[PDB]
Design a protein around this ligand. Sequence first.
Ligand SMILES: [N+]
Ligand SMILES: [N+]
Lengths: 426, 426
Amino acid sequence: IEGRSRLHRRVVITGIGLVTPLGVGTHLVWDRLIGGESGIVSLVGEEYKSIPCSVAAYVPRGSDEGQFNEQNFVSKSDIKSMSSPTIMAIGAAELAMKDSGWHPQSEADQVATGVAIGMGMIPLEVVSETALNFQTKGYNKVSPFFVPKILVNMAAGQVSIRYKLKGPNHAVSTACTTGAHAVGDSFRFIAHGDADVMVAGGTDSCISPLSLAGFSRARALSTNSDPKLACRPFHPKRDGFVMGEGAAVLVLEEYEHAVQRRARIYAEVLGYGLSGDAGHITAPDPEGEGALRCMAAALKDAGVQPEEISYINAHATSTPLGDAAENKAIKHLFKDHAYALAVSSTKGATGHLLGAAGAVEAAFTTLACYYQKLPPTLNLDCSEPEFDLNYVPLKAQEWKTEKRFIGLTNSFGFGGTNATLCIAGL
Amino acid sequence: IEGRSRLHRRVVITGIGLVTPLGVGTHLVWDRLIGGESGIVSLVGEEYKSIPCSVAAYVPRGSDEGQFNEQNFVSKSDIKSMSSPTIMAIGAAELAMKDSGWHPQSEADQVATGVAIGMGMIPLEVVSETALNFQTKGYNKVSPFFVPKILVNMAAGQVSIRYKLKGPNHAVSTACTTGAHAVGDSFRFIAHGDADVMVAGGTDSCISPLSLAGFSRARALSTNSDPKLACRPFHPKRDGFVMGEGAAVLVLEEYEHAVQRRARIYAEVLGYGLSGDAGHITAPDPEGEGALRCMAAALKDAGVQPEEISYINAHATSTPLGDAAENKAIKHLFKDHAYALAVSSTKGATGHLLGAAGAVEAAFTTLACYYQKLPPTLNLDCSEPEFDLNYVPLKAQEWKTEKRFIGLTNSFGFGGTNATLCIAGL
Ligand SMILES: [N+]
Ligand SMILES: [N+]
């Protein structure tokens, strides 16, 4: 005959694990973010000679609290067999599950818990080094681990294997929209009943001369040699994004499941919206039409009116055209209400985490909901007349409301692929 | 706290586009498959001399009907900006949309049509060739299109741009499960209301010395030098898969939407199940637990009892362990009903299309429903005691009886990622 009705369950976020250029550990990173810190640094080394971009954002490595020590998460042997983004994902997943208090042991809990971690790009250096090894030293020098090491889905696979997660096992690779799709897809799977818990997020760790060359050739990266100033979303002098690396993982969980085990609940995922610009492979719709459609779709999924939104964590990566288009979309969707909400882009602090960007920013939007405090857009000391909203410039803002705090987070990628998540306080 | 009831719509398949080693074009490819043909051939090229593998399945190229002519779909200029899998996906999507009669022109129809095309692995030679170019000829000799060519989501992106498809734009990358996830995710998006039409599928075209070396070092590939016999799913002498290339795209469409425009409908997508083995990085569970769980999840999603299944298109790639494990899962789940259904693997005809495998096999299962005719498992002239089911050996079987024709198609991937689709006649 026709469609029936089915139960659509409620989904909450009960844990967050962050491995980022601001540091390692969700709450330390939040403190640093709110305090106006940044992990953008100058490139070092002759190997970056000739490339127009001279800055990036690295995960700080070492044994100190807040630094990333791979050995805390994977063994020396495991290091050789997995890629850098996979290792970061395992770290972030470990931290997220510890943050959530969810460590499935029984077969039932194992099968009820899935993984949806995406990666935006293959580890290019693993491919090129192996090719050289193969071409010079022959077949027998190729590692039996080569293929599993290089596959985009192996962050999700290894997290599943290492933590015994037997539910849905999914991995998206949608360029800079990856981390948002991972969270949204996990939300849908839980709402649908495929799993009661999902370990969701994104990872990327591919800063190298070759990758920076590629993105510079696509004219995507900032050419500013000053790492303090390079990334400045909405700023008149913005000149391209700054490549970062890291992983962000969130534990999503069915609402009753969370309540019954007395989990700490940060926020509820209310809606997920998706669209395509269908315009250009790298340039965004200049009017921001795709961004408007995915934000609108997220609001429709959530059953929320534009007027009910308090905060938008913008994608705004510090590009001339990108930031302007998103700003346009926000103003066109929210009309007079655009002046009554707050928008900020946190990429000034983290850099652009590529496949992890949408997940890290879903984490920051979740924490903004939980704390009703908004992280700043760094470096925004002035703006053009077209940028006339509250972008939380420079300094964090309190945002207290007695009504429900509801936020959106946007992610857009090459290929014109767009997603928005609608996340709310409880 | 437990959630709210929402409309869950019905979803049908109204077009199929195939670019495969059996040829190009829907009913042509089906005819060849049903006729017992195969596209597996000897590897040609001196670059393959050192590697143990000697067979593969290529898309036949040329201007004859049934051959792939890239110039029919993409300009000579656009070719340079796109990878081989992207080009095959464009061809497959155009053919699928032609087959469906869906060419959206209105703003409403364009926004209602999304794209979900995945890719398992980008061609490795694009990376290593660019690396060499960068090293020896410098930054300013790197193609500005390098990053687009190495992104998994570019097939979905290009299909969106080229056919102005403005709905959800999503690209999964779950190794050999990719094509199944793309169709299932599309099904869920349409059922949920995100889109009324999705152009869904998978593409891969990465046969190269390094890729084959990788799979050989992983002990995944048949070393049989006879292309007529190399791939033989369920056979006593099976010894690894044969790598293929290609793309398969299906137009999924909301049921009322299809009826209203008087679409020709092939089949209904009833359910989608996902699981993870959480075991070995490349091998499936020897007892097929994960496979059992994803099949069972698909039946649950579809609202269908095991006894209602009449046909399974097996993932069975022609590996000792994998084929036995899937067979075990089928027997464990269906119990005595396992002897009442039919199971076949079509990889003897196409080879293993990697990220496209689950989509091509979804297409074949869809056509099995439509025609009530089952494609054979090639080369199965005998079997071991444990393989005691009806595998449609050698010759196609008519399947016109019982009640509703309901099929399953299974796909399994490295990282233990599993998916099943349940697809039925109407
Ligand atoms: N964002
Ligand atoms: N299959």
